[PDB]
């Protein structure tokens, strides 16, 4: 992977 993964937001 080169285009980053999405970080999780707090629900």
């Amino acid at each position, epitope marked *: 992977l080169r285009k*980053p993964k999405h970080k999780k937001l707090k629900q």
Partner: antibody
Amino acid sequence: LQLQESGPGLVKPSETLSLTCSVSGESISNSAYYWAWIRQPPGKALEWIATVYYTGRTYHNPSLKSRVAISMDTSKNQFSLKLRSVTAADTAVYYCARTGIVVTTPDWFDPWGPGALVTVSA
Amino acid sequence: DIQMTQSPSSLSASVGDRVTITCQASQDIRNYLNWYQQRPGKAPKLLIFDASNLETGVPSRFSGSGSGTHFTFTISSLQPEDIATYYCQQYGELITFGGGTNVQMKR
């Protein structure tokens, strides 16, 4: 929510820097936030040191991990920083801060403590 | 591992002038980029989070933009209370700061 550093103004070379941030207005055991240390040598840029979570999970600046110990004390609502084998390069203002504001992991720092200047000298 | 290249290192402008600062990330960090303002003797203060979002209480003359690797920070009308050092900061991977930009005023 207020943060306040507390530590020794002076630390002798080769010895261990030790600081503590006391937090009022929010529990550091709250799973919603992380708690980090940042330093800033005089006239130089900000440098993040380490981040600690209530579970014990820690993030470290790779340039400092071998000398850094970050810990949490649930009882006193405090978290600590220890930097071993200090040299003149470690003379800096050290800030505590809250992070993990929106992301489930460290994102930005708000708010900060006032900062404590630690001078390395004999 | 991810380096932020902040430019310029320092600048001077007059009251009401437009001031622009850029930070370039060595890798794509989406919009995981924040901006801080720091006065001498004071702790830094968050101005902009996630590249373009203005923090509550920050004057609208401060703005930010960018995504991926190129980010911009703008003071549309420099005021005397804006004389300070400004820092970018990514959280794509761990935490790194830009080298900083101290903003001075000509008068």
